[PDB]
Amino acid sequence: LPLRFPYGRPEFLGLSQDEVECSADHIARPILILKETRRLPWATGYAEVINAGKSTHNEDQASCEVLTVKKVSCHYWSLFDGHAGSGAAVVASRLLQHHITEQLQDIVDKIPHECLVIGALESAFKEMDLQIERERSSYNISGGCTALIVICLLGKLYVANAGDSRAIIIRNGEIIPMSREFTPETERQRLQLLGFLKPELLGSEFTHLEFPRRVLPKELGQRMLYRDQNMTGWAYKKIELEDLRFPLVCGEGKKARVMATIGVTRGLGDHSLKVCSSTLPIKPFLSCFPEVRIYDLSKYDHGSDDVLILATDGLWDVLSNEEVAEAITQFLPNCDPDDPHRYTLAAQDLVMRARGVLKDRGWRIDRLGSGDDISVYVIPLIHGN
Ligand SMILES: [Mn+2]
Ligand SMILES: [Mn+2]
Ligand SMILES: [Mn+2]
Secondary structure: OOOOOOOOOHHHHHHOOOHHHHOOOOOOOOOOOOOOOOOHHHHHHEEEEEOOOOOOOEEEEEEEEEEOOOOOOOEEEEEEEEEEEOOHHHHHHHHHHHHHHHHHHHHOOOOOOHHHHHHHHHHHHHHHHHHHHHHHHOOOOOOEEEEEEEEEEOOOEEEEEOHHHHHHHEEEEEEEEEEOOOOOOOOOOHOOOOOHOOOOHHOOEEOOOOOOOOOHHHHHHOOOEEOOOOOOOEEEOOHHHHOOOOOOOOOHHOOEEEOOOOOOOOOOOOOOOOOOOOEEEHHHHEEEEEEEEEHHHHHHHOOOOOEOOOOOOOHOOOHHHHHHHHHHHHHHHOOOOOOHHHHHHHHHHHHHHHHEEOOOEEOOOEEEEOOOEEEEEEEEEHOOO
16 A cells, blocks of 8 residues: 655654655664754754664654644644554654644633643544544554644643653753653553453453463462452462463563553554464554643743753653753753754753764663664743743
């Protein structure tokens, strides 16, 4: 089938086709930034690298614009971390904002108003999914992608997250988390519940229960700790045949997985994803619905160095919130607070601090660099006062 949109890098980078090829160098790993002569809304800074060489395309995508919800002005920043291809990421980065605009036009003025714009976003994500499900048949939309977006609507920042990217606010050196990551660990109980009530999704290969280690057949009938979908701690249970299957949810942290395949549990796409060497679908245990978090901009007067950082797992997998905050409060004093390439250079710094430098034959931050794609938005919160 033909692609739905041609693969590329975020539009606002204004790249020629040859420049895109020139950026896909797994060796050089150029850290593409926004041009001096191309300004983004709020003077937002963006920086970007390609993987170390695990996939020939940069499967991260991003886009941002000022949209107009009329029967009006809504700032939009988006970050999509694609996997198993680039179709989802590209499509979502071109059409989600339109799904946002539409779902907003329906509520453009005893339910608080913020609950309608939240509901607008969760409805929007659901219709970006679906559209990817129908057009999957007529277009090549490969893989899936995590989606993290923020809109600005009437002085409130809505950060909607569906994936493992992360958005934090640094306000006077204080880090304010504006998203939470969605993993088998943070979301075990939603999954185990679904395995129990809809057992055919486990299909006699997975148990909805969870055990502290791999359950051997020599322990068949022994007492052993387990965790159930409505449990937080652990209890014993006489191991009983069915518990020899592979555990639906297993691992610890960046080790945790659902059905030994995927480590992130929300996002878009992946309608066809099945377990390795199985006919078992995966998308049931997934959710396109984001968690929206709100930030009222008028409740505080922002300096020049009070930023909103959006990055994909490529950054947060190697650097800590703290580490990021430090490196950003330490970089911005270097640039004239009136300079607008400021934040583009802050982003480029973050990317550099995570990409690393190619040592003997590896990338090193004597800690190791990041080999995932890295995309970083540094949004200045002064432009919202
Ligand atoms: Mn990816
Ligand atoms: Mn990740
Ligand atoms: Mn990634």
